[PDB]
Homo-oligomer: A and B are copies of this chain.
Amino acid sequence: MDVMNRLILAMDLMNRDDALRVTGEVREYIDTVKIGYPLVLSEGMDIIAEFRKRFGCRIIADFKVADIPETNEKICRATFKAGADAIIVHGFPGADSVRACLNVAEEMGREVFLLTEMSHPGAEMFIQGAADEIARMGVDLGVKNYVGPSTRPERLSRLREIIGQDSFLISPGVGAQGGDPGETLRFADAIIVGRSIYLADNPAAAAAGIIESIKDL
Measured CB to CB, the closest approach of chain B to A198, in angstroms, equals: 12
Write out the residue numbers on chain B whose beta carbons fall within 8 Å of the beta carbon of A124: 94
Interface centre among A66, A90, A118, A124 (most CB of B within 10 A): A66
**Count class of interface residues, chain A:** 35 or more
User: Which listed residue, B41, B64, B71, B96, touches A66 by the CB 8 Å rule?
Assistant: B64
Interface check A36, CB cutoff 8 A: yes
Whether A75 contacts B126 in the complex (CB less than 8 A), given A64-B67, A120-B93, comes out as: no
| In the assembled complex, A121 has its CB within 8 A of some CB on chain B | yes
CB < 8 Å: which of B38, B75, B77, B177 contacts A78?
A: B38
Report the minimal beta-carbon distance from A135 to chain B, rounded to whole angstroms: 12
Across-interface contacts of A134 in B (CB, < 8 A): 126
Q: Are B133 and A126 in contact (CB under 8 A)?
A: yes
**B45 adjacent to A122 (CB under 8 Å):** no
The answer to whether A189 has its CB under 8 Å from any CB of chain B is: no
Q: Which of B66, B93, B122 makes the CB contact (< 8 A) with A94?
A: B122
